[model samples]
Target: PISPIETVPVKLKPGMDGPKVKQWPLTEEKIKALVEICTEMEKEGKISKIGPENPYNTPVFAIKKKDSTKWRKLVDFRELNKRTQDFWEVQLGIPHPAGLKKKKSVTVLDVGDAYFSVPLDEDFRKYTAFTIPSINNETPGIRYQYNVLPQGWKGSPAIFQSSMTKILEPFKKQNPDIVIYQYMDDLYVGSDLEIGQHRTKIEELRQHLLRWGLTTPDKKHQKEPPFLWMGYELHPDKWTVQPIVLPEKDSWTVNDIQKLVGKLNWASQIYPGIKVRQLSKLLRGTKALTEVIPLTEEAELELAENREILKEPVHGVYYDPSKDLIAEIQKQGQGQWTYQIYQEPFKNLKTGKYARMRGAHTNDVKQLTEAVQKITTESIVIWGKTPKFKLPIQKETWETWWTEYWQATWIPEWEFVNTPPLVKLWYQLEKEPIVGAETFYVDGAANRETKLGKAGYVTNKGRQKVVPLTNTTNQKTELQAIYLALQDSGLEVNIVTNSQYALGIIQAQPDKSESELVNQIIEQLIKKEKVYLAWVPAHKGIGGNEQVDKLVSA
Candidate 1:
């Protein structure tokens, strides 16, 4: 049984005729057999039609043979080796080959010895064996050797490839599970059955090749798939090129600038910060192009203003304390305070002008009498002599005062704390029990009673207990539990089992409105800020909540 071989790293040092190959010689019989195979393949309609003439006036064929050295120098018309520009380049999608440590057994075979001389224009003769062949006036010079097959030869690769195909044809037919393909001397056979199947396939191929006067090179059969085919490494998962080497990093060029901008413009939404950074780089490149635009004084000022604005934070409030004082004062107290008196009359005069308040006060006898009358009518006047008011007689009132006094004095005495005085409005509501009596908790548990078999728990220590959940899905479960708790507290509710799915349904506002109820609950919670979805871990020895979980599961 043949075993798969480890890949031998073939490194090409400077000028050593590349990697050394075991040289083989071709005889007249093997060459005649290969030609016959190519003729048979053409008869079977498996050969590709000659397209147009190449630069050397040679017609293209489905199969072709070439000197290995000359074939490597062939110029590619497809430009398949160009660098990728986008972040999501073709390289990004290809899986890395580093982790694919499993060695694959591949069956490789070499084609029989074949030699060819370069042909002159439409000339089939004057070809010499194992030596340089003469050509006509219109044709180029020709050379030949035991293994040398020149490029731009119309039928050499095809003939060699057809011979190989015929050699593997028997195995391909007999073992329907095997795959075989040939490119000139290179043969590939793949089978799912690793070592045994690969060896069988190779042996069958070799037997057929020997019958056709072809020979398999000893120790040249590769068991492992080469890292590359046609200059690209095969990625294990995606089966594309692996370890994609990006172009060398250098200063940005015009093309790079355009490509960066175009990519950023396309993917701006996915990564806004990255898009902005790319845009900045592109803009720097544009400075060369924009130098021709004459900068007017007004435009320069505008640019300076734009720079100033960019330097500032993206979001904040801006206010002026002088001219907008009255408006600011009104806003500060939510219209509770208004300017009524003014000192330093000159400053007040200026403020009044800016505030559009030009009214003057007159102190005539009728005005004084009218003011007095208005005060007596409108004000809540305490009609008693000036006296110091007592604090209070009740113990609760005295205690409240003491607490407030201590908080106001001692709290401020020890350390300096910034206290911005602000007022909050409070409203009184008539106490009402939650509506809907048909609500129940759909709590899940692992091993306790009332367990829904999903995995969660709920408890209330007289309505004010720590209600928590654990070892479950994310916030969705907690949200569901909250809804259930609300429902159990006598609120009309339907228990949505999965919180994450329910939230997604609600957020998407599905066309069929499948999760309208959950969405409605979320909206109400958002408005009230009372419904809270709390997450907990499962079976972690956390107190109270764990007991609740046990009971629920039980």
Candidate 2:
């Protein structure tokens, strides 16, 4: 019996229009490809022919194949998906493999047309219908609906991830070091043994797919460099992120848990160690698919666990992808997904000198670009002044450049952003100190329940400043306190805080209100005498540290 796995239902808003698409003018060659693709997909039960009318309708567009010589069909569901996004049971996220040890045997088992293989819940099938445009009126107007889950539909990836998770559940229960990570349809086999021996488990994995009536896409399976899994490489000892080839910005979207980890990279530095699991806290009161909100606990734990993996201290520049990595990054900016062959050494253009921007969606491009730029700008200046605040990259470690290159940062979870100093072409980085400095302590507190935030500052200037934040966030309060000191100090002042978060924001190129604060702070410091912003551990009796901890809570 060929039964499709059950998928989440698609709920639409009351007044929303049915699925609609404006087709691209099709050429004869594209027409042929379209027919063939349509026929094959339909035969596979991925789509079903519809009459001149059907209940559910969605938009469809003729997208040319990546090679761009021909056409591939696509459906735009962002608008439609948002309607059902309110209560979609999407445990969104593909599993991304992090924390591989050196010498571990890795194998990526890819599923062909993955989401198509999953079953759509009967009630939700009609909503997947889409229409194809004809080159001439001579051809018939035909509509197609996915009987099973089709590619690009909301909840498809989550359904697939859940199904795949169950399929491989057996492996995790039985073997030692037999970690099987389900990346949508691809299963990344990580084991302590060698290739030939690991085959036994690999066999079992294949059997599961077969049992699920799934087929593998071998040609697309990656075993070599440009070694990609969830837009990152998972080599035992060495790897870098593949550069997202800029196709265009209009195309945008995600699912697998790794999908979040991938898009939300630059956003990671905000928390000491940020995770999608904690992501729910952001939407504590909402239930939108945009929230990507299923399995919040699982998702965050997944993120929290990987936050510490790429600890391999990098050494010596090892980029061999010789394809001018910077070119695409420039045009695309941090627009789409991309990393060098192994996911190593990293930026966008503004701090372009630091790391080139990756290829991402047009809209999402700016997010990563801004995030990376903001962090690198101010942080580098401070690092340069601090006796080479360099962290070593481990020579023989399973390192995903961004996640593994850990430095003893104020926040342990953020990936390293600076370029490693080249040994061969190395130049000494020299920094002169900011002199005649006066030190002061500052802190901010936030109560999630009361929805209140507060700021505190202690200075030699007759008054101790404790500002209120019964409304703003703790971070904003921290920023406010730092600003008050910087603005009032006049000169020769060093502001200290237990708030690494606020300091990190200023250290990196800040964008929000803090943006002006960092710039203004820097300008004042560079002009007259000395001004420094730094962090101290909280709660251990450090000034503006532990003693002030109660300010926010109280």
Candidate 3:
């Protein structure tokens, strides 16, 4: 295999001590398979035995292949990934599955043992080592590492894609008319040509790849239509999805739902209109990976709906320039909005038009606005409907209106930010008072309709003061309470408040000197040698804070 890049070593961050050995329990049969695979790999020069000196060794496990019992070997690199650096700059564009429906003829070719074609850097190979436990419990466990880019390494896909792109650069330029859509080793060479011409192009591509020592096995190449590529079953005029078979278990772990979501996400990409929002309800309030959660009826219904859609074939929505485009935008739920763009179908093909493109429920208004802009700009005539709620401006004018609206709404000093300087307080949270320190408890109360506020503070020594405020909020009153307490405090004292807002303002002083009261608080803080501000729970019957609350309320 020709290495496109000079050996780029895996650079591990320093301070990762000793060798990492991650071994999973394997059945006797699985151990036999692992040994068999490793023996062949060593013979083929894909891997080699590593001495005990190697510093990194990850677990190698087998996963059952889709629709088959055959196990695919993979290395787990989660630990090694935590200490690695410099992969952030790597970027590769994976073509969308819609490319499958774009051409009259297409070919899907898999580069055999794809990642194995790209050699790992000499030094980096040691980090890719994996351990296999004893076969019979008699012999010591054997360890072997990769000589080529390992399949489960986070950088393997991008590195392999880069190498493949370099190898295909000349071919791509030579056959400018052929569209090469690839995701890692899977190459989808598509064209508008007839079957014969498409086969000729595929032959040319194969010849080019063969020169680079990359070969697609005959079984791995899908040169004709009616074959699956990139998760979609592709035919001349339509594509169908391979729906995920839901497990029989009534309860699912967070990890289970995550895996299901990932699969559904991939499948849903080809069918843009499918909304998986119902899954969120099942996922909500889950704190741990293995936490058992019951699936709700709505999520079950949605999954069933998706299954029904997947069972049916999906015809392409032809976007003719002569047709007018329309978009429908609506608020799906609190903080979630969705939009669908449609093209008026040619009269002869279908009775009802389907969405050409769709956006999932997004919290960002800007995203929906951009979707509208994309639809409006693509067609000569366009219309839009917001059937559920009224927008400030007409939906059709979103392309022109949203830019100014977004800028005005999101400005740093928008009118709705009538938040007083009190909120600018970014105080650290604390539960207990400083030991052996003079402490004061502060509280604040406000009547919103009257715009009247009262603040009070009581010292541990029974010293206290109350201040009245006008045209103020609870937050402002809270700050004023802290202000009064600090003013009466000794050079070194602890100020405790149930009002986190009061503590926040005094601590953050984000933009100091915003108001006269804020300026006074800052000045008081600067004058003191040490003043600790802490927050305590309110109305829980704490001594000093409760006394102050009663004083302010009265």
Candidate 4:
């Protein structure tokens, strides 16, 4: 153990009042234990005997342990930190997890009495003062302070980080290839080397540790996960995950949900594309799933779908990326619009629904323009059925042509409304952008006992006859708003609601929802025009949100 390179105890802020003296009731055993601890520390030159003539006094206290016969002493310096101006100046970030990514083994090493290994300047030792009460005739009370950095101080962690930096420098020089990343006292090592190599290298590493006055003890280890070995069936140099086969239950209970959530979470971490997240909405990450509530058909279907998703290969796609990506644009109203542009593989942004695209431009038009820009810059050679973006100027030239076509065909596109004239599309351009108005509000109301639901869409088209829906649950009704609006897109419209379920279906890939009507509606509308369902707080004073709330209730 070595003193840290940092000098001086944290200097007190000017004009800051020192804390009032701390005190606690004394006990015989407590005093005895503290005395012994102080003696050992003093002998190590970690603390010193101080006379009463010196100033800056504070109270001492004992911290008791269950198995130990003697308690340890602790300083109440929390008040000191509150009074001082110089608290921690800069907080260090958490350690990186990269080194352990593909390694076979991990070891956690503990540092015994770690904080005491680093100390401030001896000249500032008096700053850490505490008093000892009289225990016996020969032992009158005494006042003393720590010379080494103590655990209960403002900058102790920084002091310790300083000490660790000095200690780790030589280790890096000697074993340049082996990995060591320290987060406080936890030392983690993982590398590409064989387990046999680790055994021999550990001996050299163990030798240097002892020479550096440190040791990794087996009995002292904590939070140790059960042992792991490289897979036996796998090739000698490779690491592979063997799938877990769990037998399905004919019916599930709360106990099953708990077991499956934990087990699936473990399995999903190694194979994320498995869509483990889709397994259950009712219970997945939720607490309070008691026996009182019966699981829904949606949940059961998800469980089966989850099982099927797991059977999928590690590298596979659920749908065509370009088409899936185009359909994903319906979530435009979720809020903030700017995100940085970057390339990530196994998925892409635009036309890669499974991935994402962030905006470097100001508006959706500009955002769309930049996305076209990536055709040449990012080699977007093929777009859906056309390879128009394959040539450098092809995308840009097409954009010019599309703008003129878009401007010319804008209105008559809505002129084909064959349903009632009441349901119509209104537009805004320039002073009005090429946007639509008339908030389409839809909500579902269910008669819980009868299993029937009512769903309606409200717009400038005014209220239509609220339709009675078959096989209605609240979830089913909420979904009806989307289907009714799409069916009606002159079956069409702009949608705003408070339903997370309805919005979830529109934005993400659907794994479950047995309704063929709603599913067909979403399938047709994905390319007609992007339908964004903006969420608004229900029952608030907003005319549109309030009107729908009224419609659902009526």
Candidates in order have lDDT scores of: 0.32, 0.51, 0.63, 0.51
Candidate 1, residues 63-106, lDDT tens digits: the string is 23364322121211111112111122121122122112223455
lDDT per residue as tens, model 3, 1-554 = 44354455567778763238668777777777778788889997888896688756788788678989687887788776776554753443333333223577778888887888778878777777778878755578888888888876777766777788888888889888888877778887887888899898898888778767687888988866776876656666555555456454667888888777666555543443354667655776735999988778887887777677666645444333444444444433322333334444221111111122232212124433443444333222222221121222333333333343324432111111121211122222233456666888888898889989899888878788888888998888887887887788777778878876555444432223436777677767767767778778988998788788988877
Please provide TM-scores, in order, for all candidate models, with all chains considered together. Answer: 0.25, 0.46, 0.58, 0.44
Give per-residue CA lDDT, model 2, range 1-554, as digits (tens).
54345466665677765555455455666555666678787775677786455656666556667776777677777656776545434454433222233445667768876777777777666667766655544666677777776666667766777777776666577776786656566666666787777776677666667777777667865555435676665454444444322212222222333344444453332112223334323344634434344445554454445345333322112222222222111122212222221223242111221222232111222333343344433333422111111222232211322232233313122233334321110111112334555556777777777767777777544446666767767666777777767766755676778777765544432222224545554454444445566777877876545545675557
Worst 10 residues of 3 by lDDT: 411-420
Off by over 4 Å in 3: 1-10, 14-27, 50-72, 82-84, 89-93, 99-101, 130-137, 140-143, 244-279, 286-314, 318-326, 331-336, 346-554
Candidate 4 regions with alpha-carbon error over 4 angstroms:
1-9, 17-20, 26-32, 66-70, 83-108, 135-140, 190-554
**Weakest 10 consecutive residues, lDDT, candidate 1?**
349-358
Give the winner by lDDT. 3
For every candidate, C-alpha RMSD to the true structure in Å: 32.7, 16.9, 14.5, 14.0
The local lDDT score (0 to 100) that residue 404 gets in candidate 2 is 28
Rank ordering of all candidates by TM-score, starting from the highest: 3, 2, 4, 1
The best-first sequence of candidates by lDDT reads: 3, 4, 2, 1
What does candidate 1 score on TM?
0.25
